[PDB]
Amino acid sequence: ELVLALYDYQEKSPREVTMKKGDILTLLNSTNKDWWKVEVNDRQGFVPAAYVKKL
C-alpha cells in the first residue's frame, strides 16, 4: 500500500518521521485511527493519518 503526503510534516518526537507534500510513502500500519506507520525512503515511523491519502 502507498499513500500520498497531502502536507509537509516535520517530526516532533522519536517515533515520528518527516515527509514533504507530494511524497509517495509506503504504508506499513494503519490500525491506529490517528497515526499511521509509513516508510519514507530509508526511515520508518509515524505521521498523522489525516495528512496522507491512500492510493
Curated annotation (Swiss-Prot):
Q: Where in the cell is it found?
A: Cytoplasm, Cytoskeleton; Cytoplasm, Cell cortex
Q: Which intervals hold domain SH3? A: 1-55
Q: Function, please?
A: Morphologically, spectrin-like proteins appear to be related to spectrin, showing a flexible rod-like structure. They can bind actin but seem to differ in their calmodulin-binding activity. In nonerythroid tissues, spectrins, in association with some other proteins, may play an important role in membrane organization.
Subunit note: Like erythrocyte spectrin, the spectrin-like proteins are capable of forming dimers which can further associate to tetramers. Interacts with ACP1.
Q: Which family does it belong to?
A: Belongs to the spectrin family.
- The protein in question is named Spectrin alpha chain, non-erythrocytic 1
Naturally occurring in which organism (per UniProt)? Gallus gallus (Chicken)
Q: Which residues of the full protein are shown?
A: 970 to 1024 of 2477
